[PDB]
Amino acid sequence: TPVTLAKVIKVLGRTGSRGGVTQVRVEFLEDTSRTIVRNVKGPVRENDILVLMESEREARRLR
Amino acid sequence: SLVVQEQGSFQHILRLLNTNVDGNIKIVYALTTIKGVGRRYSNLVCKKADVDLHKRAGELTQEELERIVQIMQNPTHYKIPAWFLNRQNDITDGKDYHTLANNVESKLRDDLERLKKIRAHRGIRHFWGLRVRGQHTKTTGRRRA
């Protein structure tokens, strides 16, 4: 079970056709100041711990 | 509250009045499976010929069961109110009748026959195989508590 943490520092906005998915700037304690643009399904604010399966990803703007 | 025991005298799936009384269930309901007896009537019968109503149908003496049978066949002279019977008042002899067993269906057919013979409208509907009650004609019929 490879698991990684992710604290949300900013939320760029709603994305996708239906708009039930949000672009989020996640950042974790395992080496701070290293960031990803991740897509989140549910409702998200500042200081929300997300459970990541993989670190190396780049969630790009849905079309 | 208290657990009984008993032995191999228990006889499930016994029969009475051309029909099989179902074992391993309460006696009232077991009776109810008979054509011509339903729930309320069965309960009444049980109350009259005093069976222990918690006890199942597969137990109990044959003399008792024949008392029940006697009651079922001969209700009005065993002090049963005479508003309770299914074919109440009747249209031949002019006395109350609880039609029972497979005879009820036969009796029903006889009624349905006499109607057609008479040539009442309802009889004609029956003959045609139509919704006989004069109700709004698009039916199935159901279902609340």
Added chain:
Amino acid sequence: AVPSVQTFGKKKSATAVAHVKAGKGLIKVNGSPITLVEPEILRFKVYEPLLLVGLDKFSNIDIRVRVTGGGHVSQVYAIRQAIAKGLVAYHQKYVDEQSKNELKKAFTSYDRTLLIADSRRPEPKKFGGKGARSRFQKSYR
């Protein structure tokens, strides 16, 4: 002559009306000892005002409530509210303020509409539908 106060509690259309005075302890309702009440599950709701602050402060007083309107849960909510408000008001008049403040803060932190009433009230039904926002089904074909 004797010291006493009276307050109320609301929920939907349920209305509870309390009476408090200086006595021996007695706390009862409509047609109930406060242990029994109804509905056993909810029961503990009626204690909430008594327990959160502490039962020790219901030694010298005598509370008694009567209610009208609503349903069971609603009634319970009303009665508990009445018990609360009646207590705090009693403290306010016949005891010092600091105690009342302590009581409030104990309650208001927990607040299940404990002091203050529930401000939601039934929205009306409108035509072309069984309920308020609900509407009937349409065909096209």
Added chain:
Amino acid sequence: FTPVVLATPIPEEVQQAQTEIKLFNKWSFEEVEVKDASLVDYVQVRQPIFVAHTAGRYANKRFRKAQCPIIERLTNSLMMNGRNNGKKLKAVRIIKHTLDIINVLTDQNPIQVVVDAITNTGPREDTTRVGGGGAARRQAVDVSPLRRVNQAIALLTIGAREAAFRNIKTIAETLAEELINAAKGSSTSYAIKKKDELERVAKSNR
């Protein structure tokens, strides 16, 4: 732990818990830590409650839904199907019964077990269907802690319900079974099965 006398009789069996620190009737909100990372916000436990009724308004602002007590949320989730819409009393009753059942099997705090089940059963990854306009697949995304909680509760309640439906086991029993199974990686539970399904199907997008 000092008792107290009063004119009306309040039983000492009941009065004990009332006098001492606050708790669900018998079972306590004390101890009962948040097990997993995340849900240190979106699971309650403190503030405590006597019974899980607490008829306020939660889905109103946006995330006060989170600060609603998790047991009450569970109760709410249990309360549905139309036939069983409203009847919160039934739900709370069955919650209590579930807790009892979870105390009987395995011992320990049943609230803690429930918490564990919640923490496990939320699918850490989840996907959704992109538009396209003809033929498109599931696109891989992350899921929120609140959303994780929501799905956890939903899935447990639904699986428990279906399991009960037309089986001699009551909701109290089936739900309890689901919980106890869901505490660890049992996998025979419905919730965890669904989670697995959601994860494998997610993992089939890279």
Added chain:
Amino acid sequence: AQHAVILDQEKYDRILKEVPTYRYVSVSVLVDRLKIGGSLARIALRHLEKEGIIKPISKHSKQAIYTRAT
């Protein structure tokens, strides 16, 4: 017809034996092993309560609930 309704003889003895070995007991558990029907399950449960053996943390009908003697 799954049955297991009437007690017979040896099945009562078996119940007497195997009840205290369980952690949890209810009407569902005492029908789960194709044992006694609902009526008897209830009756027998009440009996086992009466005659030591199982300790109630119970409440009401429909959902009955007892535990082992400890």
Added chain:
Amino acid sequence: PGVSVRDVAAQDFINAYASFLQRQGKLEVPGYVDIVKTSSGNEMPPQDAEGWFYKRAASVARHIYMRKQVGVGKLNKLYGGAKSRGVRPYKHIDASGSINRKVLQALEKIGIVEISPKGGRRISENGQRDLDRIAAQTLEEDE
């Protein structure tokens, strides 16, 4: 179908009495009782069978107790089942009022209740001192 038991010992409050009313040897059964549905919108008779009338006696004793003064029509309204016709869900509908009347007529005889001004019927001071005191003595015994 019925009213006012939510509070105290719903079943036990009116069970130790039920056998005690038989114990008294004063009760006065209709005769056609115990072969009856108890309501127009019901389906079965009670499962107590050798009893039930004694439950409904203390329940009517409780009814006269309840408040001020009570009548026949009110009792019909109360113990009335509500009637299930076809689709027509469960519209509130009167009871087997005759039974309640019979119960009243019994209770009046036993020295518990009497006919009041403003119509209706009211509890006596001598009345329930002995009747439901022994049944609720179980609550006094446990206490």
Added chain:
RNA sequence: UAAUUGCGAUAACGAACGAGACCUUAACCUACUAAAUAGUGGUGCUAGCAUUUGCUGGUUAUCCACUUCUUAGAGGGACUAUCGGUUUCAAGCCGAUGGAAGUUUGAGGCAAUAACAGGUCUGUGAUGCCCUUAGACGUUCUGGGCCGCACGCGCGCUACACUGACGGAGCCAGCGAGUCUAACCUUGGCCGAGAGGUCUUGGUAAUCUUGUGAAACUCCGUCGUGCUGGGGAUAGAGCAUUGUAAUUAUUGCUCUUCAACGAGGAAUUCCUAGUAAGCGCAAGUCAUCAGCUUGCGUUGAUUACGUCCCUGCCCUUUGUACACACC
């Protein structure tokens, strides 16, 4: 910004309607005005089950005291109020504080200009032209029919079963409505399994019906997985009511047939809070009949709090061989 709402910019300048404002209603006034047609408390007469003084009535009479609840009248009250952020730092927006109320506080009513050859001559002694006018499509009496049908399509409301259905012990409401030149709403006592019948009584109504002690649901017992017991159709037989008249059964009850049905392809309807959903209740038609609607409460969820992809709407730019306007 819900909004041609504003802030601003500026060959425009001031203006009018619509929106908003306004009206009713929903909630907060332990302040004013009071109230036996609304309550509560104290004193003479009650303490009979959980009671020692639940709460109740004894108590239209026992007199007094009161207005928190209940009713209204008059006013106050919320203005995004205070704090923080955020923005040419402006209009505004997001969070926090208090607050009964902080989504224009919710809900409605009212709702512009120009249209459609939308519906209605079966609401109208509203009417044009046409038709008919005493074997009259006029008016009226007798008897049918509009209910002719296991449905070819459309809406509609109980619990497919153990968060169940029973047997009881179940169960607090709120809109209403109500007799006169008569027979409406029925309390009360008797009889009746029953529906009902009867003798009367109260009421032109915050007083009497009527705390419409409604239903779902709280508590124990009865089944417990089985087109069975769960609950009482389709067909028969009787007994009631309403009405000149019930027959192609008006309704209601009673017993016998026993059925909430095996979670409903493709498809498509409504839904974001006291809502959806559950559940009854009254009124509207009414002699009688509700499953119809119109309101009312009761229990009370999940899930967003977003987007323009589908279905459409508004504006601006543009393109147009269209203008009965992309059918």
